[PDB]
Design an enzyme around this catalytic site. Structure first.
Site, mmCIF file in Angstrom:
data_model
loop_
_atom_site.group_PDB
_atom_site.id
_atom_site.type_symbol
_atom_site.label_atom_id
_atom_site.label_comp_id
_atom_site.label_asym_id
_atom_site.label_seq_id
_atom_site.Cartn_x
_atom_site.Cartn_y
_atom_site.Cartn_z
ATOM 1 N N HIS A 129 149.796 58.167 -42.724
ATOM 2 C CA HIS A 129 149.139 56.975 -43.313
ATOM 3 C C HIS A 129 149.059 57.215 -44.817
ATOM 4 O O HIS A 129 148.495 58.258 -45.161
ATOM 5 C CB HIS A 129 147.719 56.794 -42.693
ATOM 6 C CG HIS A 129 147.707 56.303 -41.281
ATOM 7 N ND1 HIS A 129 146.679 56.404 -40.385
ATOM 8 C CD2 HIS A 129 148.648 55.695 -40.522
ATOM 9 C CE1 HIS A 129 146.935 55.910 -39.203
ATOM 10 N NE2 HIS A 129 148.153 55.417 -39.292
ATOM 11 N N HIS A 178 147.843 61.914 -38.213
ATOM 12 C CA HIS A 178 147.186 61.878 -36.934
ATOM 13 C C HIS A 178 148.286 62.464 -35.980
ATOM 14 O O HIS A 178 149.417 61.935 -36.069
ATOM 15 C CB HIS A 178 146.783 60.535 -36.294
ATOM 16 C CG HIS A 178 145.890 59.810 -37.265
ATOM 17 N ND1 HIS A 178 144.518 59.858 -37.173
ATOM 18 C CD2 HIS A 178 146.190 59.133 -38.382
ATOM 19 C CE1 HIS A 178 144.020 59.183 -38.219
ATOM 20 N NE2 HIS A 178 145.018 58.785 -38.948
ATOM 21 N N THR A 184 141.035 53.408 -38.973
ATOM 22 C CA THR A 184 141.086 53.835 -37.597
ATOM 23 C C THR A 184 140.076 54.911 -37.251
ATOM 24 O O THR A 184 140.059 55.355 -36.092
ATOM 25 C CB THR A 184 142.540 54.201 -37.134
ATOM 26 O OG1 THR A 184 142.847 55.461 -37.844
ATOM 27 C CG2 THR A 184 143.625 53.146 -37.369
ATOM 28 N N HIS A 229 147.509 61.080 -45.093
ATOM 29 C CA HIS A 229 147.087 62.075 -44.076
ATOM 30 C C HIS A 229 147.861 61.720 -42.785
ATOM 31 O O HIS A 229 148.488 60.633 -42.787
ATOM 32 C CB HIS A 229 145.581 62.100 -43.809
ATOM 33 C CG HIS A 229 145.160 60.716 -43.428
ATOM 34 N ND1 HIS A 229 144.836 59.731 -44.326
ATOM 35 C CD2 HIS A 229 145.123 60.142 -42.190
ATOM 36 C CE1 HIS A 229 144.542 58.620 -43.659
ATOM 37 N NE2 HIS A 229 144.765 58.884 -42.393
ATOM 38 N N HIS A 263 138.536 66.188 -39.950
ATOM 39 C CA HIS A 263 139.178 65.348 -38.914
ATOM 40 C C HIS A 263 140.688 65.249 -39.146
ATOM 41 O O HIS A 263 141.461 64.917 -38.229
ATOM 42 C CB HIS A 263 138.521 63.988 -38.738
ATOM 43 C CG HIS A 263 138.370 63.233 -40.002
ATOM 44 N ND1 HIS A 263 139.253 62.265 -40.446
ATOM 45 C CD2 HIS A 263 137.394 63.322 -40.942
ATOM 46 C CE1 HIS A 263 138.841 61.789 -41.603
ATOM 47 N NE2 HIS A 263 137.721 62.420 -41.928
ATOM 48 N N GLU A 307 148.829 56.590 -33.556
ATOM 49 C CA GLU A 307 147.700 55.662 -33.275
ATOM 50 C C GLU A 307 148.299 54.355 -32.842
ATOM 51 O O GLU A 307 147.961 53.815 -31.795
ATOM 52 C CB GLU A 307 146.874 55.506 -34.551
ATOM 53 C CG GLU A 307 146.164 56.851 -34.883
ATOM 54 C CD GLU A 307 144.952 56.630 -35.746
ATOM 55 O OE1 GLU A 307 145.005 55.982 -36.759
ATOM 56 O OE2 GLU A 307 143.955 57.175 -35.238
HETATM 57 ZN ZN LIG Z 1 144.844 57.501 -40.703
#
Ligand SMILES: [Zn+2]
Ligand code: MMC
Length: 258
Positions: free
Chosen positions: A117, A94, A196, A92, A62, A104
């Site tokens: 993050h 997003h 999240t 990591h 992911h 996010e």
């Molecule tokens: Zn994250």
């Protein structure tokens, strides 16, 4: 089936397997800058990453995680809204399929190209697995990415991405200094939230930095070349691995600045 970011297993479907998805302290949220309360009792953040020991980079299906040795107080976060020390376990990102989306959290509904993050766990709990059973178990530092000038410190990451293209792949990744990903200013917003992505556990104190970092179009581009799928499976590009903003509910966002 198992959770993802697609049409059939995406954020809108998470509640089926993880009912906390509709919980009271879910993340991310929209940060309304005019409703955020300046709190003068908030102390400045303390980031001690000088002794950081990165170990490996992994595609988990992911995102891609950079992992650090957390068996000692090597890279910690303290101060701000926190009580106690929090050790860095992994970081990591997003990101989106386009530059206009990917983060996010949002600021006055503005979406950034990506969001970093840095995940930390509360040392009073002894390990990560126990920290996730506590309301003050984790601290996540969130940093926005905007497209502009390249970020030198991100290049070593961009470069190993080819070797961890698919789900399950990992590469040795030592001597990476995360100090290279911090903006100049440490002004932040803070609120009580959750992870999240599933399991969406409400164990997080979120620390979202006001100042974004710049990355080049070419750097974000390499992120978009990763695969959600495992080797030998049909190719699905890893893009849009972000969850939309959730209702603030009974919460207040505090600002360390005015
Ligand atoms: Zn994250
Ligand atoms: C309660 Hg985590």
């Amino acid at each position: 089936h198992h959770w993802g970011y697609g049409k059939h297993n995406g954020p809108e479907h998470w509640h089926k397997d993880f009912p906390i998805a509709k919980g009271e302290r879910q993340s991310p949220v929209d940060i309304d800058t005019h409703t955020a309360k300046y709190d003068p009792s908030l102390k400045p953040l303390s980031v001690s990453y000088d002794q950081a020991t990165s170990l490996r980079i992994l595609n988990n299906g992911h995102a891609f995680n950079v992992e650090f040795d957390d068996s000692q107080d090597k890279a910690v976060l303290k101060g701000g809204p926190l009580d106690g020390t929090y050790r860095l376990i992994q970081f990591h990102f997003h990101w989106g399929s386009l530059d206009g989306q990917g983060s996010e959290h949002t600021v006055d509904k503005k979406k950034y190209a990506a969001e970093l993050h840095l995940v930390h766990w509360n040392t009073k709990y002894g390990d990560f697995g126990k920290a996730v059973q506590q309301p003050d178990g984790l601290a996540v530092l969130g940093i926005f990415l905007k497209v502009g000038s390249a970020k030198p410190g991100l290049q070593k990451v961009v470069d190993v991405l080819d070797s961890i293209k698919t789900k399950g792949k990992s590469a040795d990744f030592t001597n990476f200094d995360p100090r290279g990903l911090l903006p100049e200013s440490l002004d932040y917003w803070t609120y009580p939230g959750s992870l999240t992505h599933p399991p969406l556990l409400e164990c997080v104190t979120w620390i979202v930095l006001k100042e974004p970092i710049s990355v080049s179009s070419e750097q974000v581009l390499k992120f978009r070349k990763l695969n959600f799928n495992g080797e030998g499976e049909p190719e699905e590009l890893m893009v849009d691995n972000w969850r939309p903003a959730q209702p603030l509910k009974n919460r207040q966002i505090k600002a360390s600045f005015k």
